[PDB]
């Protein structure tokens, strides 16, 4: 699952210096996570997903 | 004097507020549990 | 000596996002499995009603 699929084979970005890639990728992911967590937690549905119940039955 | 503060991390307010919402915090209900209005 | 001055103030920040995510996943899992467990039993309790009624209808046919 964690080995994301190669869907857009970006040929050059395989071996350019990891020591000047990793900190960028950490900051971009911290930013994605701040945006995603702040916009998940803005939803009124955000306690129902965390405590789900359903009744189709009449 | 030059006895400086480490920067006061704004995210430790924000991930703290998210931790309260995750733990199911309501600023209406838990203020009413204290006998107080929002 | 090099010094790789990547701030701790970011490493504790991402591991505060990891804790938010994994806490939410576990809070969902335990409450969702409880819904799925009784949702199958609620379907089984209605298939009991299906089976006997469909079989009674077959004898009456």
UniProtKB/TrEMBL annotation, chain A:
<protein>
    <submittedName>
        <fullName>HAUS augmin like complex subunit 7 S homeolog</fullName>
    </submittedName>
</protein>
UniProtKB/TrEMBL annotation, chain B:
<protein>
    <submittedName>
        <fullName>HAUS augmin like complex subunit 6 L homeolog</fullName>
    </submittedName>
</protein>
């Amino acid at each position: 699952d964690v080995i994301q699929y190669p869907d857009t084979i970006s040929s050059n970005v395989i071996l350019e210096s990891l020591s000047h890639s990793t900190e960028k990728n950490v900051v971009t992911c911290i930013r994605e996570n701040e945006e995603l967590l702040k916009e998940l937690f803005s939803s009124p549905h955000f306690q129902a997903t965390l405590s789900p119940e359903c009744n189709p039955w009449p | 004097m030059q006895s400086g503060s480490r920067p006061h991390l704004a995210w430790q307010r924000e991930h703290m507020w998210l931790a309260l919402q995750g733990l199911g915090f309501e600023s209406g209900a838990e203020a009413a549990n204290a006998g107080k209005t929002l | 000596t090099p010094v790789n001055l990547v701030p701790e103030d970011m490493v504790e920040m991402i591991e505060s996002q990891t804790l938010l995510l994994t806490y939410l996943t576990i809070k969902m899992q335990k409450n969702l499995f409880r819904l799925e467990e009784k949702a199958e039993r609620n379907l089984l309790l209605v298939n009991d009603q299906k089976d006997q009624l469909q079989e009674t209808i077959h004898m009456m046919k």
